[PDB]
């Protein structure tokens, strides 16, 4: 949360209109992460209730 709070501080300062920020846990050393991350980055943009 100390890293999480920082990006919130950084966003609430430098954010303009139309601006959307996304923070995620990520490990570039893991091939699984890379595949799973972009599989997340590339799918839908949809929220099913």
């Amino acid at each position: 949360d100390d890293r999480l709070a920082f990006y919130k501080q950084l966003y609430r300062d430098h954010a303009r209109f139309d601006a959307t920020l996304w923070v995620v846990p990520a490990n570039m050393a893991s091939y699984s992460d890379i595949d799973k991350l972009v599989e997340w980055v590339g799918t839908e943009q949809t929220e099913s209730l």
Binding site: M28, I34, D35, V38, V41, G42
Partner: protein, 145 residues
């Protein structure tokens, strides 16, 4: 990672070119004191060849090569901070993080974006550390020592 986003772009069928800024290390071979940056990032010239070889990668990914010069952080470079003034006495420029960030955005401008679409762009963001005659065997080690 480049291949991954290339698949998504091809599968979901976009002609949009992803601009990948390649964080190249400044001026390989003229510094012996870095020990990490200088050697590792010289194969980025070979990576630019892979894009110049592979034909179908053009539409998905554009390679923007940036050589990131001397840039002062507190944590890693806390030893290097004192001699920043010393290296700058050779008529060379060392950069703050905000300065280098600005140099990276300028590559993200519309003008330089289209330039990357036509052909790989190699940018030297270094402060002239290339023609530097400063001996790293001393002025680096001594700085670190």
């Amino acid at each position: 990672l480049i291949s991954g986003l290339s698949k998504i772009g091809a599968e979901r069928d976009i002609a949009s070119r992803l601009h990948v800024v390649l964080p190249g290390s400044p001026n390989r071979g003229m510094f012996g004191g870095d020990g990490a940056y200088g050697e590792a990032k010289s194969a980025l010239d070979a990576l630019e060849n892979r894009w110049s070889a592979e034909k179908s990668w053009a539409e998905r990914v554009s390679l923007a090569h940036a050589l990131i010069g001397w840039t002062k952080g507190t944590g890693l470079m806390g030893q290097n901070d004192a001699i920043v003034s010393a290296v700058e006495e050779a008529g060379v420029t060392t950069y703050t993080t905000d300065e280098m960030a600005a140099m990276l955005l300028d590559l993200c401008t519309v003008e330089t974006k289209v330039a990357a679409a036509g052909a790989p762009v190699k940018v030297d963001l270094t402060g002239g550390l290339g023609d530097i005659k400063i001996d790293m065997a001393e002025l680096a080690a001594k700085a670190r020592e």
